[PDB]
């Protein structure tokens, strides 16, 4: 249907299917037990922050690669259950969308990953140029084909240097994974999202010392911001003042994961409001904790 | 009198196939992954339309995506769904299985979804004419007793040409399930009832839980590859060695194809002997594949 102009936040990234069980204990080998719980949940960074850049009231869009089957339907459903858009999914003709078994031990939080990605082919610099870029106001790219993804954050560059300052395309860009081949875009995007993980592969013992060591990497004018758990989240920009926000985390920690997609989001979510990036710090802070202490996004607004 | 009707369970098994089981806390990548039909009830359906007998499932399911796949399956394998017990809210059961591909074991976390089972209520809107033979898979005792007890009062008033088979299993070492081992033609008993009694082999089972089935009854106790057992009234113990495939890939299930190769060898009027050597030659052939394709 018609999409207005300047109206979506898109993420480029991946999507997975959790099947999540919680288990009084771990099953031994050749055993049939009954689970406390279940729930089948959508994964991936891209797709976690759709979910939750819909629940606080912004139009958004997934662009990700998916196979036909039986995994992909339910995915659809469960981006269409939360408003998301879906028509820049890349289809491939073979394969299937990646999906997991993920058991929790309640007695000790433990938890065993049955993975199945079967490789799929990712988001390539053809797809993305065949997306029509004005219906867009921020895009957010999950750092997974670097070389690729580059030749996207060019084009969209190409795109906002004949543009008015107002119908510019805001960036941001996701380094997530401890991948050498991804630290190329750190040097891309506006705002630029360093994790933890990441921060800790490169000898970097808090958020102040990751953004402080890896801002000579992003480009001129670019925010490094870099969340840390319960040490809240720090944000550095071209003036050099070191932003922080304190965690707000809940009366009781029943779920981080997403966490990191929540306050990623909330943080793209609050700027392209036009909200300062202190403000946007605060915000990613206060719905990635409130996040904590729920079992999956329901209920973070 | 031509269909063989299953009463049981249907769930949505998530199987991941792994080249050794994950020790806990851990990631791993599996071989492959499949969404297949499981459920004891419905497994046995599978091999029954496969081995080609007119066959019907009966067990409750609720309107869903889970649904839409495990009923898309069930007619791809041709079996009949029209005895289904729809509900009106929840989800139809599923589970994560993970299937060593080193020893073809199979660990169930399993996702009873409280939905409620089939009645006794809604078992008496079957019309039993168009069934030869009605397997009842043990799940709520109290309630499957009174369908026993209709079956065995729809044989008192038919000759006994017309008259309907039935065999029970009871397969959970639940004590609600043992009031089922009086009720049936065969008693299927499984190697975890008989090891939760303090029996230790197929031949110790039998022997020992015999006395529990009703007059004229046959128990029969499969005992993975030490083969399966059978006892009848004429009290002579009767074996099967067991086929096993030279490697073993996936055992999930085996238990469902031997009772319905049972059931099916049976039906067909062969000997209690003949059908316990079937059941584990189908058995035995579907431990070496990967669900249930290739078993004929
Ligand atoms: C600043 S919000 C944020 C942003 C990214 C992340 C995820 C990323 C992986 C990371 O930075 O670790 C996490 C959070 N935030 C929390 N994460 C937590 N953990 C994460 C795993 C840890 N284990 C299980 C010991 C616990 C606990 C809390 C707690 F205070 F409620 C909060 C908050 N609030
Ligand atoms: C007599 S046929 C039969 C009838 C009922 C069952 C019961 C079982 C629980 C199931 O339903 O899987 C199993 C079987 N048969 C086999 N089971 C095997 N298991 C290895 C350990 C697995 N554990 C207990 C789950 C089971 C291995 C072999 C091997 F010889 F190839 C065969 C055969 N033949």
């Known amino acids: 249907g018609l999409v207005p102009r300047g109206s979506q936040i898109l993420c480029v990234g991946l999507v997975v299917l959790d099947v999540i069980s919680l288990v009084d204990k771990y099953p031994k080998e050749d055993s049939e037990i009954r689970c406390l719980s279940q729930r089948w949940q959508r994964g991936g960074n891209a797709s976690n922050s759709c979910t939750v850049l819909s629940l606080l009231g912004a139009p958004c869009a997934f662009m990700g690669s998916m196979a036909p089957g039986h995994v992909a339907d339910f995915l659809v459903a469960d981006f269409r259950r939360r408003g998301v ?5 890349a289809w ?36 993305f140029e065949k997306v029509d870029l004005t219906q867009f ?10 070389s690729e993804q580059v030749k996207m954050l060019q084009r969209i560059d190409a795109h906002n240097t004949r543009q008015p300052p107002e119908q510019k395309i805001r960036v941001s860009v996701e380094v997530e994974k401890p991948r050498e081949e991804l630290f190329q875009l750190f040097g891309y995007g506006d705002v630029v ?30 925010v490094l911001v870099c969340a840390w758990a319960e040490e809240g989240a720090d ?3 071209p003036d050099g003042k070191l932003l922080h926000s304190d965690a707000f985390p809940p009366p009781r920690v029943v779920d981080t994961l997403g966490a990191g997609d929540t306050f990623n989001a909330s943080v793209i979510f609050s700027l ?12 990613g802070c206060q719905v990635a904790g409130k996040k904590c202490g729920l079992q999956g996004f329901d209920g973070i607004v």
């Open 85 to 89: 858009d879906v028509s820049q999914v």
């Open 137 to 146: 106001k921020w895009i957010h790219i999950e750092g997974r084909n670097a």
């Open 272 to 283: 392209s409001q036009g909200r300062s990036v202190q403000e946007a710090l605060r915000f």
């Open 193 to 222: 999202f360093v994790s933890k993980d990441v921060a800790k592969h490169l000898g970097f013992q808090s958020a102040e010392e990751a953004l402080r060591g890896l801002y000579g990497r992003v480009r001129k004018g670019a």
């Open 92 to 127: 491939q003709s073979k394969g299937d969308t990646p999906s997991s078994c993920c058991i929790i031990n309640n007695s000790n939080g433990n938890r065993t990953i049955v993975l199945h990605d079967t490789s799929l082919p990712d988001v390539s610099a053809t797809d």
């Open 235 to 237: 944000a550095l920009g």
